[PDB]
Amino acid sequence: MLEGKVKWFNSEKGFGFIEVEGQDDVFVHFSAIQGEGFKTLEEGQAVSFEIVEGNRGPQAANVTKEA
Numbered sequence: 320m321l322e323g324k325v326k327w328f329n330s331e332k333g334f335g336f337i338e339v340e341g342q343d344d345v346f347v348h349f350s351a352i353q354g355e356g357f358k359t360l361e362e363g364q365a366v367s368f369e370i371v372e373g374n375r376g377p378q379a380a381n382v383t384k385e386a
Contacts, residue, residue: 321345322367322385327362333359337366337379344371347379354384 324364333349337360343380349358351368360366365386368379 328360335360345377352382
């Protein structure tokens with residue numbers, strides 16, 4: 320339901336931080352994104368997801384890679 324732009328991402332574990340305009344920064348984890356053939360988000364890639372409260376802070380849930 321929410322949308323954010325990937326600020327950065329690591330190819331090691333396949334994850335990156337996204338920027339949700341309106342809410343603080345939301346981190347994203349490979350398992351949080353759908354796409355076994357490309358779970359690694361590309362910095363600057365827009366995606367969809369919900370904010371889940373996590374110890375580290377805001378995390379991306381159900382991340383959908385969007386154009």
